[PDB]
Amino acid sequence: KCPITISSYTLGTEVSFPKRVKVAAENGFDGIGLRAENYVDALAAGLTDEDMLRILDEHNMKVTEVEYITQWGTAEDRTAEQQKKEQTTFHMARLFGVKHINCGLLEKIPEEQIIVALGELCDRAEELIIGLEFMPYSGVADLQAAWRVAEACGRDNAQLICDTWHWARANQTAESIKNVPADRIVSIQLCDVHETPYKELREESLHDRLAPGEGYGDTVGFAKILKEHGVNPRVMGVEVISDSMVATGLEYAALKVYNATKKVLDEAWPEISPR
Numbered sequence: 001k002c003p004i005t006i007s008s009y010t011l012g013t014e015v016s017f018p019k020r021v022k023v024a025a026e027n028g029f030d031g032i033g034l035r036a037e038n039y040v041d042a043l044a045a046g047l048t049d050e051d052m053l054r055i056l057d058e059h060n061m062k063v064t065e066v067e068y069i070t071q072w073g074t075a076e077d078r079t080a081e082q083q084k085k086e087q088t089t090f091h092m093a094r095l096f097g098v099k100h101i102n103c104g105l106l107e108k109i110p111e112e113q114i115i116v117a118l119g120e121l122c123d124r125a126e127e128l129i130i131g132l133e134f135m136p137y138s139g140v141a142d143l144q145a146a147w148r149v150a151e152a153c154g155r156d157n158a159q160l161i162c163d164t165w166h167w168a169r170a171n172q173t174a175e176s177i178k179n180v181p182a183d184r185i186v187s188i189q190l191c192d193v194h195e196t197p198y199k200e201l202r203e204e205s206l207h208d209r210l211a212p213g214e215g216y217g218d219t220v221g222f223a224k225i226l227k228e229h230g231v232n233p234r235v236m237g238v239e240v241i242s243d244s245m246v247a248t249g250l251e252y253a254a255l256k257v258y259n260a261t262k263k264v265l266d267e268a269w270p271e272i273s274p275r
Ligand SMILES: [Mg+2]
Pocket: 013, 243
């Protein structure tokens, strides 16, 4: 089993929790992703952990993705708020029954420092899996780099996330997955890329992604690579971060990315496609 999950950013940063759940459920998703910010907003709106569980249950829904841990690479970055965010994701994962937490490292630090910091983060995570996400503009720039550091840290909960946008913008291929044990890839996130990159790649990534297979990043070929390598993702996230789609409509966004996801997985991995 692999829950088709609408990732947090796919619905923006404003929508209430109950609307997020409802829009997801109405559009055929098995789960939602939640950022710590979304969770804090819900608490600020007077919702409790308990109420969030009830609402999910009311829509036959689950939170299946928890994110996003960053700013863990250096002593100066690991501030009290950083550490609060870490702790908040850990609690969120336990609460909602999620086994892994999405993680990225923006800071371009020497890799030996990354190995050590990653090990420490996995220690902090205890039973939870750290899903380290490579990104072309980050301190872990491609899949080989992510595997190198996860491997070297020597914690079994150091695992890997493949997000189509990052895969395509880091120009990854079939060879990128070489020597990466399939069972180390904890999740997959689907979307697609514009033909022409932004000047600032990080702006593009957070503002102007395309729906799966509607772009120039061979989402279909990407899914097939991971499938054939023997990856068994815990979640199939759909992470299409698009200010334009959200501005058009949440329902619009949700329908558009579901239909696109179904198109790609029908072709590439029918056994887990939504049905
Ligand atoms: Mg915004």
